[PDB]
Amino acid sequence: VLSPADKTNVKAAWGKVGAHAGEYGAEALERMFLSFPTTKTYFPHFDLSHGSAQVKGHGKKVADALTNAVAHVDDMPNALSALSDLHAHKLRVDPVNFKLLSHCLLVTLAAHLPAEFTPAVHASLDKFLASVSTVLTSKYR
Amino acid sequence: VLSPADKTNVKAAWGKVGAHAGEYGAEALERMFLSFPTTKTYFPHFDLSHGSAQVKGHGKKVADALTNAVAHVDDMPNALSALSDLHAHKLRVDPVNFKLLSHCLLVTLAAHLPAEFTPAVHASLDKFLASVSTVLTSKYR
Amino acid sequence: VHLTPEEKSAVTALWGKVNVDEVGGEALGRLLVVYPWTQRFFESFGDLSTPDAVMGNPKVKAHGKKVLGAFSDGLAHLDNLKGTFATLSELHCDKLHVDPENFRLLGNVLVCVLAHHFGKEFTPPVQAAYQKVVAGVANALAHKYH
Amino acid sequence: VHLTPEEKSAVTALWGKVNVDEVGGEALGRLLVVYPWTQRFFESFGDLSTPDAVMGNPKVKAHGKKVLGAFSDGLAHLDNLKGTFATLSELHCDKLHVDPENFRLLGNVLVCVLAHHFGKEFTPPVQAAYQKVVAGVANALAHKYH
Numbered sequence: 348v349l350s351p352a353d354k355t356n357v358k359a360a361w362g363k364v365g366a367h368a369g370e371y372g373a374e375a376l377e378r379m380f381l382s383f384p385t386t387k388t389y390f391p392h393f394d395l396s397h398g399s400a401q402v403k404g405h406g407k408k409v410a411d412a413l414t415n416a417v418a419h420v421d422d423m424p425n426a427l428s429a430l431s432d433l434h435a436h437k438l439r440v441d442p443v444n445f446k447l448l449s450h451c452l453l454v455t456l457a458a459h460l461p462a463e464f465t466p467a468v469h470a471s472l473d474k475f476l477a478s479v480s481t482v483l484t485s486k487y488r
Numbered sequence: 489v490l491s492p493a494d495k496t497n498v499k500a501a502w503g504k505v506g507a508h509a510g511e512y513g514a515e516a517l518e519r520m521f522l523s524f525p526t527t528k529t530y531f532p533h534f535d536l537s538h539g540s541a542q543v544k545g546h547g548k549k550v551a552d553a554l555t556n557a558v559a560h561v562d563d564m565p566n567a568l569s570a571l572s573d574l575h576a577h578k579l580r581v582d583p584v585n586f587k588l589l590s591h592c593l594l595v596t597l598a599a600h601l602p603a604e605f606t607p608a609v610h611a612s613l614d615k616f617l618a619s620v621s622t623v624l625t626s627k628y629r
Numbered sequence: 630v631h632l633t634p635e636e637k638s639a640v641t642a643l644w645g646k647v648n649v650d651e652v653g654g655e656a657l658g659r660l661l662v663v664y665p666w667t668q669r670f671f672e673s674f675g676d677l678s679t680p681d682a683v684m685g686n687p688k689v690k691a692h693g694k695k696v697l698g699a700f701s702d703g704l705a706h707l708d709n710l711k712g713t714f715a716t717l718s719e720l721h722c723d724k725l726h727v728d729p730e731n732f733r734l735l736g737n738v739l740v741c742v743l744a745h746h747f748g749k750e751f752t753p754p755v756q757a758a759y760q761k762v763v764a765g766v767a768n769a770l771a772h773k774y775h
Numbered sequence: 776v777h778l779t780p781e782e783k784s785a786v787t788a789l790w791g792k793v794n795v796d797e798v799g800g801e802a803l804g805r806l807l808v809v810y811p812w813t814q815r816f817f818e819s820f821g822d823l824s825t826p827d828a829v830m831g832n833p834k835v836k837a838h839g840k841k842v843l844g845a846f847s848d849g850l851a852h853l854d855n856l857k858g859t860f861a862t863l864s865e866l867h868c869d870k871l872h873v874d875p876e877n878f879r880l881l882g883n884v885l886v887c888v889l890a891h892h893f894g895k896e897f898t899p900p901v902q903a904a905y906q907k908v909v910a911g912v913a914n915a916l917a918h919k920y921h
């Protein structure tokens with residue numbers, strides 16, 4: 348459960364992302380493909396080259412979902428139910444990969460937000476991404 | 489989330505266990521210690537040899553908690569709230585190990601319920617154990 | 630994997646008794662039921678909408694046998710699970726696009742089938758040995774992913 | 776670990792720029808804050824009730840430095856992580872009773888620290904190499920556990 352402080356930390360951290368969330372989502376995706384090559388197994392149909400516009404594009408999408416998750420922090424279950432159904436029912440992405448993408452997001456945020464990527468903010472964002480991941484794989488069975 | 493069928497399935501399986509639960513608790517731990525040596529890190533103060541009375545004892549305790557979890561399937565959070573505090577604030581058992589014992593508990597069950605250990609039961613039990621795990625680790629941070 | 634001699638001894642000694650036909654079908658089958666997401670790769674198998682639809686699915690039972698047979702053969706070269714599984718590694722990656730974590734899930738399902746079937750004979754020690762095996766395989770099978 | 780030659784060259788290039796004193800203290804401190812159950816092992820390091828309590832803790836700071844030192848040395852022997860950490864693996868197991876899973880938590884936090892620090896310079900390919908190393912280290916450390 349996200350505490351008042353976690354929510355604060357995340358609204359602020361994400362706030363900062365702002366206009367780059369697309370750029371970031373994409374970058375985190377590249378990080379994930381390189382670090383955990385097994386993850387590529389869900390994107391057979393993509394151009395997974397450095398700069399792919401297909402990655403940029405999907406990265407925007409991922410980011411917009413997180414922004415929207417942040418926007419509805421007190422009702423994440425409902426705010427992301429559509430995406431949970433999708434991941435759970437159509438894509439069928441192994442739960443373990445949610446932790447890897449999360450790690451990559453954290454790594455991307457850290458690389459970009461020096462000032463804000465504080466121990467307390469790191470702990471909060473870690474908790475947030477874990478909560479998002481939990482939502483998203485809640486309907487798997 | 490447990491469906492009404494899962495609940496039936498588990499109430500059923502567990503009713504079968506009956507008075508062995510304790511027997512089966514101790515067995516599952518034993519399997520755990522041998523198969524996942526890492527898990528022993530948490531019981532440095534126990535006798536872990538085969539037959540250990542400490543292990544038998546604890547087995548019962550675990551079993552009793554499962555039983556209780558079964559009885560309150562619909563309010564596990566409340567029923568187990570206290571164990572959640574304990575594992576979260578005192579034991580501080582890495583969440584990874586819950587998946588280990590659940591598997592060991594499942595193997596044990598399968599070896600003692602040929603007949604009842606059906607695919608549908610198997611699947612329902614996995615889900616129930618994962619829910620218990622989820623509850624016990626909900627207060628970690 | 631680092632198997633004890635009593636480890637290979639016991640592994641080898643229990644497998645000897647395994648009916649690969651139904652252990653194979655029962656393990657892949659249970660995988661589809663317990664971890665619904667794994668079905669992703671067997672839509673072509675048909676109606677998997679139920680435990681019964683899956684269990685009695687002959688396309689499942691037949692794939693299960695092949696898997697067990699291949700598994701069954703890696704047991705013959707414990708000493709080099711990677712060489713053994715090299716080609717199956719590249720296939721599952723490059724062709725099937727199967728996520729290696731599935732291999733880990735199967736291994737656990739497999740240990741459950743074996744305990745189910747051998748009961749009292751699948752002792753803690755014996756499970757231990759097998760856990761090592763299933764791990765080794767998972768690993769050997771994931772080894773050529775890139 | 777089987778790191779490309781440009782992997783080991785890149786890992787290497789960056790490491791030379793890291794201030795071990797600090798990074799270690801930052802890595803260990805972030806571990807205790809992000810996964811507070813890890814604190815279980817440092818009751819004698821005093822106050823770790825708060826992020827500032829943890830991060831400014833001189834003991835955490837001091838411990839952090841020894842960790843990174845040992846880490847530093849493993850990096851001079853990428854080809855023999857296991858021999859390197861063999862004595863530290865036994866200690867952590869047989870004396871410290873630390874679950875190896877903590878080694879994996881720490882390697883990821885360390886990756887977040889390096890990223891935090893090198894910024895744009897900590898690219899996808901550099902990270903990829905770093906992940907491999909951290910994994911090599913946690914496996915090397917967990918190797919003598921029994």
Ligand code: HEM
Pocket residue numbers: 386389390405408409412413430434438440444445446448479480483
């Ligand atoms: C916080 C975690 C995640 C979020 C917020 C997220 C979000 C999304 C969104 C917004 C979409 C597209 C839906 C649309 O087009 O309306 C999507 C699709 C997809 N996701 Fe995720 N996802 C997450 C985790 C993952 C993971 C871990 C994987 C696998 C490693 C994955 C694989 C995919 C794939 C393969 C698609 C479909 C691609 C396409 O055809 O364009 N997702 N996800």
Ligand code: HEM
Pocket residue numbers: 527528530531546549550551553554571575579581585586587589620621624
């Ligand atoms: C669903 C899984 C679990 C259940 C039902 C469970 C249940 C229990 C129970 C009933 C107790 C005793 C508390 C008392 O006397 O009131 C206990 C304590 C303890 N648990 Fe768990 N536990 C679970 C998972 C784990 C795991 C995975 C580990 C680590 C491998 C673990 C480590 C411990 C330890 C070390 C103790 C202390 C007991 C003693 O010192 O005598 N538990 N747990």
Ligand code: HEM
Pocket residue numbers: 667668670671692695696697699700717720721725727731732735766770
């Ligand atoms: C011990 C683990 C496994 C072994 C030994 C194994 C073995 C095999 C073999 C021998 C084949 C046929 C390839 C050939 O020789 O032409 C195959 C194909 C295949 N495997 Fe696996 N497999 C394993 C695990 C898995 C898992 C866990 C999944 C996903 C749930 C999976 C998905 C598939 C699929 C979809 C095919 C292609 C079936 C077809 O349409 O012919 N495998 N596997």
Ligand code: HEM
Pocket residue numbers: 813816817819841842843845846863866867871873877878881912916
């Ligand atoms: C990156 C991997 C790690 C390295 C290189 C490492 C290295 C070391 C070294 C060099 C020592 C001192 C040796 C001695 O006193 O004889 C030590 C002690 C210790 N390590 Fe680690 N360590 C690692 C990971 C961890 C983690 C993740 C934890 C738990 C979160 C941990 C818990 C401890 C504890 C509790 C001690 C003794 C602290 C005390 O003085 O009370 N280690 N470690």
